[model samples]
Target: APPSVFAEVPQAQPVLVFKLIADFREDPDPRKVNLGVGAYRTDDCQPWVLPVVRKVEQRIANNSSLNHEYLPILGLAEFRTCASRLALGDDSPALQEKRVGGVQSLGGTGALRIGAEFLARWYNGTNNKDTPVYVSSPTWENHNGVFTTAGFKDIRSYRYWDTEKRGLDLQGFLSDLENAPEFSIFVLHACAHNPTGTDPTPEQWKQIASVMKRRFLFPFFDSAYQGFASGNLEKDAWAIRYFVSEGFELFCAQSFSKNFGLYNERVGNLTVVAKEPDSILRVLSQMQKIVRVTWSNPPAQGARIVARTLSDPELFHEWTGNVKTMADRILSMRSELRARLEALKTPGTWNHITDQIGMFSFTGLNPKQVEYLINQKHIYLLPSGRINMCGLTTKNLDYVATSIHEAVTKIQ
Candidate 1:
């Protein structure tokens, strides 16, 4: 047989920060602290399982008639309805207009891929002939791959983070939105922006919405952290609701992983808001086409569990409270880390550590500094200087803070 055509195809290495921590897993350093990956951990450095999730599992298991059935192409009808309310809010005018279509996604990642494929095949040429999808300069690592793999052309970026200030580069962000080609698509983190944890203020969001409206930009929102951001679901969803209220047709990808502790279950939703209800059917059809070829249909268990949590008021309240607990723990750690760094008089102003909100903090530590923490202090973090705030606990915050202080000062 001829040598396989794939023989020389090079394997792409895992993205930098992620690969660093994964490779170090086998290292048996007792003091080693890993902040590289962005998964949430408890104060005791344990994976958290939400109380409501546990109860829901028990509820499902107790039902003798619960069978593992293949859900429809669009998934559970109740799941879709509840997901729409969860994302858009029960009072959303869009829902009343019947302009929104909701479908179950495998997770945030799958929703994005499904959206990318839908746009690449349908919306790319029809709305704006061959226009590229614009993402933030420092977007989620996998965003670029998801779009390009779906055959979208010219996947690119607009400025987002201001590294010097460790904050949003609002001026740069606005300028790019204004200058972007008409009908170009842009991906936005709805809340708790990954890596940087830097998000636009309400006023900033209004300005962004206004500029995108004037420029006729298409917005695809990746809302991975809802209640997980401020411990308030409604507050976190304000940006997306604002955009939709302004009469902008948009797409949203919602993840249940962080809030529900359903990481491995792969539950999420893709909501498409169009001008008309029929347009939703068109979008759903395209999405289903891609999903059919991809994972066929999303798994039933997670969606069922999430659906139950959303529909039952008692369970919903419990789940939401659980979400708040996660957020509160993360916030507490941030306060402790910032306070300790200040006490040590870390070389640079450590205010950004607390200023940035969400699961991760930028930390402002560079590659070499990060390596120093890993090698000398047995600390682990992404080379890009992002630390998972959830990894900070009452038990280890002092050590982590001191390691950071030393790492920064030693490099000078």
Candidate 2:
């Protein structure tokens, strides 16, 4: 038979981090290090199944009364409720007013795609949808792709990280928000920002909120780290809660993969906060349409774990400690790496290394230095000089630090 019509298919560009992982795996050198990963790793350089997750998984399996039947199109009822409460807090007036709703998703990425699709299709309550969306200058990397694939044509970037200071560009950021067209969507990192690890302080967030409110810009939050960021869930979600308290109707995409250590399970929540339950219902019904067409329905296990942990007081307390454990480890990694570099008297200032937070840190290494680390030391970090802090361990910290010190001095 002749070749099928699929014979003309084009090859898509590879995801950089996934490609980096593949390359790191193929290296036969025992000294090779992977600082490019997104998920949390331990002091032993192994993926940890949080003790809380293991406990929950065991309990769910033992419950003979439970079956494998599919959950509602919106997903597990308890999971959605807990996820919404987790995002907006229980005291939120929106929650009391019944104006907030959630939909379980494949993962945070899934929530973003569904949310973007919902906004692109129904934001203005019509099909004319050409509203522009703005993401941070250096965002999660898949953010633009998720929105673009969902039909956003005018996707642009707003100023976020300041190159000179290696911190939040509040002035530049507020200016961009001020300049944005009325009702333009701005994707905000709720906490523990990816890549740069630079989040606005509470006061800075207030300033940002002030400008966005004055400009009538909409906030679309991507909250991936929540409890995993500051080891304090309430602190991590402060931005979202603050926005809600300010009477701003917004969308927040929540991810549990990192915080719950359930990456493979692909569990997430898409939360919509409006003025009234009636309007919230109207938004959720449309989200249901999107979910129905895409995932049809989400899986049960991951959400089940999160739901069980969040609802049970004892388990919830334990899980908080477990999350803090992970966060503390990353903190140590930052401090140790920074101390090592300063001890070596590495050419540049090392304060940013310690200043940055969460799972990743922008090491401030130049592209040439990063390449040197990969080419000579077999250390794998992005050309952007971002490294997953979880990749550091007591055993390898010395070596990695030594390699970095040499790279910085040698390259320049």
Candidate 3:
């Protein structure tokens, strides 16, 4: 027998999210609509590339001296400087005081892994611990998996999304925090929460921050969509900024994939806001230690492009405009979907579809109904009933609404 390549680890099951989308692609039905993935598509239902990204790429290509040199163990210094400013405001006190530590990563997921591993080994005790990180109950499905893979124990849930209301369960969320163990880590969606688009209003955010402060929990924010949620970049970043202003020692992971339409580029950063100025250097030194043994260093091209776009005033304005355009398109889709569903007399308030923000809507579709959409209508979505709002387009909105109405009515 040949030596086994993967004899020890168990065979992995299909990644349910991607598998459905792949299956949807294989279906030749002309009416088939894939709302499965959280990717942004044009009004004509096609992947979009930000014009600003192209401009930056051209500038890099024109510069012949741009070599394929390996990045440093902590990734590029220039990239980190811009990335940190982009996440925390340009004039953030942390940046002013030199109290922020950061590293470039593959993207949001990569940043998460780096943070997760560091936490599991350190915060979870050298020999594991009593309580692991707590994530929102209806958070991005991959959150638990990422933390578990990093060897964190007691990975538990905190109350969050209220399915019936299609909004944040603020009271329940506060209650969970109030009761949760002190010094335990809590992962927060900085903006435009995935799977469910529900977010806390500004006033609600203040209350949540107060509760978190009282609980003495460690806050780790995952900022996947900075400007994509609202048209304004700073408005979307209010949650993290609020927490930072409240003087919390936090960790933040940022993704440029959605806002910049740089999906494949895998560009993101892991930021650690240390209490003291020197703590920043210490945290970054430890991050490099993990980066050295892990992916070694991040890919250079994407980070460089992001850095270029952010640093150049002309490109920065252009990029923000482009982000607004994409967000507007998704918002238009939301309104149209709701109107169409109502016209069809779909049971229940379809307003939730538009009420929620960001890339997805909880849709209030149950498991079997979701299955029916996939099997019969060929309208694919995450099994948890999350339909990517970005997947909705003018061309397919009518059919998509009709299919959803049919599925919901049939089930009831």
Candidate 4:
């Protein structure tokens, strides 16, 4: 009976990122470097916890008024208010018109699930069964999984990166946007695109928007890094604000994990912007319906910390200041990596490293090259050749550059 029960089970293969993380951990090489995950690390190669987060968390934990009471299915009201402002400026037309609302969830990933489930059921209403969904040719791998589990049927990809130039393939990207069927859904990275750090310039963004608006496509933005991309918090949110300014109704899944260094807290907000002011309330109720069935509600600690930090004037100033420091460090790493690789006279160009922005660089390495970085160099990165810039540090920069040079030289 026991054998019968196990006979037909299908085996699941290891997840690419996690399996490599395990492999890197088991390798005790002092020189080993892990660039597999997108999480930020200090110049000392340590995970960081923003000082502001600690201050707010302790204040909340010590308050006599605090309790273990369950949060509403829609999550914290204060967090939604402040978080929506952060995503689209406080003065935004969308904010002023009362056409925006947010639902709290388990980080960016879970917020995405909530949006997908809601979309799967109601996007086209009766025609929901075969809605076309498009993500970048190379996007965060989890995007596909979340949409698939939510019952989406026609998931597709839009061109994103240029393989040879190693830059934004705006032509191909726009072509896809222009050609997509009406009412198609496109998952856009709001800022600091994952896998590849390439972003559309403001003018380029305008071009993409024209096509998308004309094509009648739906945009679902994933904003995981608001303040971490550029040193200024407002600057990083340009794309979403631009779209909102242009009168596009949208869905955005926002994460506070990276900027606040609250990774394990799973803090996130799903923001919905609609054309009509009354549309928001109806949308919020539908979000709560899905929230009631799935996770029921979100955890309170992370929401409290973020809410307090964003609410109080003193805490907001301190938190914004803290974000700049992390952004500065990542920028410095980009410059240093570019200089070192060039200094090594590494084969091919190193300029793309500097041209890219955010947590990762599409290092232009093929799968075989990345494998060499792992197996021979003791340095781990995605087979797509994306290396988390946050993983590179001053102490390890020399070895990493030297190792990369060796891989490029010998592999060629």
- Per-residue lDDT, model 2, residue 44, is 86
User: Please, what are the lDDT tens digits per residue for candidate 4 over residues 190-289?
Assistant: 8888879988888999999999899889999999989988978888999999999999999999999998989999999999999998988888888899
Candidate 2, RMSD to the unseen true structure:
1.2
**Candidate 1 residue pairs that clash:** none
Q: Report per-prediction Cα RMSD to one decimal.
A: 1.7, 1.2, 1.9, 1.4
Kindly provide the TM-score of model 1 when superposed on the true structure, using C-alpha atoms. 0.96
Local lDDT at 215 for model 2: 80
Estimate the overall C-alpha local distance difference test score of candidate 1: 0.86
lDDT of 2 by residue, 148-214 (tens): 8988888889999888788888999988888888889999999888889888999999999998888
What are the Cα lDDT values of the candidates? 0.86, 0.90, 0.86, 0.90
In model 2, the Cα lDDT at residue 370 comes to 91
Off by over 4 Å in 3: 1-9, 124-128
Per-residue accuracy of model 1 over 249-357 as CA lDDT, tens digit each? 9999989888888999998899989878788877888788788888888898899899999998999988888999988988888888889999998887777877777
Over all chains combined, what TM-score does candidate 4 have? 0.97
Clashes of each: 0, 0, 0, 0
Cα misplacement distance, residue 314 of candidate 2 (Å): 0.9
Estimate the TM-score of every prediction: 0.96, 0.97, 0.95, 0.97
Off by over 4 Å in 4: 2-7
